[PDB]
Amino acid sequence: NFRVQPTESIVRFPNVTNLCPFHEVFNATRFASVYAWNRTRISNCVADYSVLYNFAPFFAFKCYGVSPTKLNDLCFTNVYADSFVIKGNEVSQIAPGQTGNIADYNYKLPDDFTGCVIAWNSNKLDSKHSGNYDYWYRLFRKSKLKPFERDISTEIYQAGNKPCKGKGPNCYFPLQSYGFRPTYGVGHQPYRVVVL
């Protein structure tokens, strides 16, 4: 018998479906207070991620979760893009496992699958050589918060030597203006960071 023929035509269901809140967190001017992790529920979609791959050096592209590929291709409901600022010593803690000072008081991440958290230093962008004291974070909040919550709850610290409000002398701030400088380490450089 006889027939074969190849020519691939794969005209697709969509036409112009809305992209995503992507290129809106990757490219936002003012992120949230760190404990108020600006998770959204990223919108309906065409979240065809490739606008991911294009970007200049991230310095944190390591997909905290599934491989840094396949996100464009896989179809999940929402990746709940979080938005917050940090400085590097806190950014070190932003990873699955990897509990540390800020993922030990403020910003914790679960076992895996933190989307594809994409950190980067924001030297020129969140601190001036006046040594900016802008964005409030919580060290000595009380203790490490449980993996991946939203912490607009900035419960104050149990500092002892006193029954009244727990706070030791008075007002033990879980309100730490990130208090960094462009002349520090990047552990203490301004850091604006996108989470998924």
Partner: antibody, heavy 126, light 106 residues
Framework: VQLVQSGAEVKKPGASVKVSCKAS????????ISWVRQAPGQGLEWMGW????????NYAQKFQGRVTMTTDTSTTTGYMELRRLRSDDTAVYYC????????????????????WGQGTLVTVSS | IVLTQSPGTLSLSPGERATLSCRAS???????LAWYQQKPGQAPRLLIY???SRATGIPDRFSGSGSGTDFTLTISRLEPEDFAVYYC????????FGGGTKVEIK
């Protein structure tokens, strides 16, 4: 990011405006464009805001029926429309991506009036 | 509440519209917030009261805008006149000056 705006707009005392704001190389749908009216010397008058997603608009009581913010979602060019133009009304405005009221909800969110319009230098001179 | 002159070393040659973020923290109405130019090593001038607004002394070439926490002084075609040191103020909330964003040269 460029938010391409109109320029020396020539309106009249008794005309309506269609200011341009080319929603620039950002995913237009996932944001909302606020506006302020830089009345000459008067800082900026709070104009309002379009939700580039749905078009939820917080107009200015000053311009209640006057400002009626619309947009060409197709060619992504914002049209903040003010009737009641005049010489005393000939004042420049700008665009701003409203991340104060994060869009989609008409609800206050973190961030400021984000990246801005070029400038609509409305010349309604009489 | 804090202010942040982002382009501390904004390098745009004269004759070209630039953008200078002094980038506040709150949603402050510019009714308070302002700008103050100092010669690079002198006392601040009354640069931009109203924080976008042009007074007598300021030429047209100086440009800028902004609200909320992302005040972008979108400076127009430049001059050595515009090469002083400009300090965006905040008359609101216990005035913290600006420290940064000059406009520089080749």
């Amino acid at each position: 990011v460029q938010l391409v705006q109109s320029g020396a707009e020539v309106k009249k005392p008794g005309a309506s405006v269609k200011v341009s704001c080319k929603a620039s190389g950002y995913p237009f749908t996932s944001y909302g464009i606020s506006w302020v009216r830089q009345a000459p010397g008067q800082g900026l008058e709070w104009m309002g805001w379009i939700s580039t997603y749905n078009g939820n608009t917080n107009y200015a009581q000053k311009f209640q029926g006057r400002v009626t913010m619309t947009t060409d979602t197709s060619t992504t060019t914002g049209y903040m429309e003010l009737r009641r133009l005049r010489s005393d009304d000939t004042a420049v405005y700008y665009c701003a991506r409203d991340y104060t009221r994060g869009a989609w909800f008409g609800e206050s969110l973190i961030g400021g009036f984000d990246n801005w319009g070029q400038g609509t230098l409305v010349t309604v001179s009489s | 509440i804090v202010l942040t002159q982002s382009p501390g070393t904004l390098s745009l040659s004269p004759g070209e519209r630039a953008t200078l973020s002094c980038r506040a923290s709150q949603t402050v109405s510019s009714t308070s917030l302002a700008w103050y130019q100092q010669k690079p090593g002198q006392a601040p001038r009354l640069l931009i009261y109203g924080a976008s607004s042009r007074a007598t002394g300021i030429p047209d070439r100086f440009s800028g805008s902004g609200s909320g926490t992302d005040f972008t002084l979108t400076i127009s075609r430049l001059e050595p006149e515009d090469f002083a040191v400009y300090y965006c103020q905040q008359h609101d909330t216990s005035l913290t000056f600006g420290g940064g964003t000059k406009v520089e040269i080749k």
